[PDB]
Amino acid sequence: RFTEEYQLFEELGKGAFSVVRRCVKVLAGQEYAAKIINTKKLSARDHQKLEREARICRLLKHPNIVRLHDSISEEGHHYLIFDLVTGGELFEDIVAREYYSEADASHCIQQILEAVLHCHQMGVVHRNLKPENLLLASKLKGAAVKLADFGLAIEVEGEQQAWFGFAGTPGYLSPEVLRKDPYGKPVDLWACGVILYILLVGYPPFWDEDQHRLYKQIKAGAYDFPSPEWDTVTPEAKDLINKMLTINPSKRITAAEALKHPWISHR
């Protein structure tokens, strides 16, 4: 039984037809986050989506990816045993601090890039990167960041592109996805550009309350660096945002290239 090996304690978080609770593996004494999904509320198709997310999590072992340690199916309940990460989402911390210093944003994006690079080398594309699902080890400056929520992730064959469907989060969507073009790994680096812009000034590069006009902004790469807040941001921060928010997906910087950019490598 799940309850034979793990003891449940307090709720840490709440999803649709899911909760997250702190748990201890009894024999080990080790603490984990248990995502408990009510599979009574899911069709076969959506059960199988859950088993796919678990399988992709199992492929990925990396200090900046939330590690799935176990996946247990019981009558009406599925349990996903993750690393316990208690720092809350990157999103909440950006709102609390308003924006990050270049030193803190650089250390943050460097870890995201290592994680994305690992995903891309394993043939996994997240498709849905955003501060909302990047988890912090703590509220302390320089805290380790981890990628979470592989529920929309896909597997690609080498550098081959294909139409993998319309999915992700509106404000973070790549122009190639909005065009319905075949796509691959670069969609993640567009999302990294959006995340980096948000990190440095605390608002997104693309937004309109009209989703059509939001989508026209993204497809046209219509963002800028308004004064006064962007006046004190280094040209190299801007240059790395520009190479990530490149509409052409072949010209757009890769995770491997981003890790060599002077704003990452020459601190």
């Binding site: 308003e98 909302e132 992700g168 509106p170 000034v201 608002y203």
Partner: peptide, 17 residues
């Protein structure tokens, strides 16, 4: 700055609710 311009950072769900 974000606060002086009254800009907001608001969480977004995925397309696939």
């Amino acid at each position: 700055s974000k606060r002086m311009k009254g800009f907001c950072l608001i969480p977004q769900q995925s397309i696939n609710e």
